[PDB]
Amino acid sequence: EATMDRSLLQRQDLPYRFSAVDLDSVDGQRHYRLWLGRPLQAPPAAGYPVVWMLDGNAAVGALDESTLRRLADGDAPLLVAIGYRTPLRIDRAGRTFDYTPASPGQADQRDPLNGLPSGGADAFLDLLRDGMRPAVAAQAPLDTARQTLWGHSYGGLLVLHALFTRPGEFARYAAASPSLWWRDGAILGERAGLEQRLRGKRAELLLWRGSAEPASPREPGQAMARLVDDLRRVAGLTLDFQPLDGLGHGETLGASLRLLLARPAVE
């Protein structure tokens, strides 16, 4: 419903400069703009570490000047906000499709919330690998062993799908207020076999949830607590759950992103 925040983009007085890289989905239906924030600092020998953010029209709006100045500590990351070509802060249709996994059973697969087409998670993650990273790498040197993937809500659902089904693409996975309720907890089933799929890899998972969030949009915290308890047991996986006192669902997006970017950079 609301406009995105372009102010940051056209600014010049910070230690980051932002440029756009455009791509379409393979099926031609969805239209992306990746906003690349490049440190003024020269790349490390092995390339910049990279932080990929879903809901990027929104994520750019949540990159504050204070955070951006501190990120320039001599090992600054490349920031890649994966947005949609639209004025809006949020792209309902695109994001609903791109960030939800397929539910094998269903023919026309439709979001149980807003009824839009869903189930494009794997196509999206494939496009990240096969089209986005190629384009981003051409603009700046990347350290592909030091990559972070962040998302909020359905974006967090996506992030969990990536870790659970295709672990090791990213070093750090960061899921804020992941929509665990989706399809009566369907994402929770995808976690079966994770330890086996993680063999020979090490990965970090950061989770957030706000104290004021309901269990779904229509027993708060139970699902998350059980997921955390389970994942704590997984060899190779470092888990950090951070509850956010005083926040509801919408507000955890910005909070998680600011807190993520304040963390130590990935090894």
Ligand X SMILES: C#CCNC(=O)[C@H](CNC(=O)[C@H](CNC(=O)CNC(=O)c1cccc(O)c1O)NC(=O)c1cccc(O)c1O)NC(=O)c1cccc(O)c1O
Instruction: Give the footprint of Fe ion on this chain (CB under 5 A).
Output: 217
> From CA 154, how far away is CA 7, in angstroms rounded?
26
Contact letters for ligand X, residues 68-107 (x by CB under 6 A): ----------------------x-x---x-----------
> From CA 246, how far away is CA 102, in angstroms rounded?
33
> From CA 177, how far away is CA 249, in angstroms rounded?
7
State the catalytic residue, choosing from 118, 179, 204, 213: 213
Specify the pairing of strand 16-24 against strand 48-53: unpaired
Give the shortest CB-200-to-ligand X separation in angstroms.
Answer: 33
> From CA 178, how far away is CA 158, in angstroms rounded?
8
Whether 211 sits among the annotated catalytic residues: the reply is: no
Distance of CA 56 to the CA centre of its chain: 9
Q: Which listed range, 21-29, 38-46, 63-71, 215-223, lies at the site for ligand X (CB under 6 A)?
A: 215-223
> Which position among 29, 114, 211, 238 is part of the footprint of ligand X (CB under 6 A)?
114
> From CA 172, how far away is CA 91, in angstroms rounded?
25
Q: Quick one: 32 or 48, whose CB is closer to ligand X?
A: 32
> Which position among 7, 10, 28, 218 is part of the footprint of ligand X (CB under 6 A)?
218
Whether 152 sits among the annotated catalytic residues: the reply is: no
Which two tokens mark 126? Answer: 């494939």
How many residues bind ligand X (CB under 6 A)? The answer is: 15
Active site amino acids: 153, 213, 249
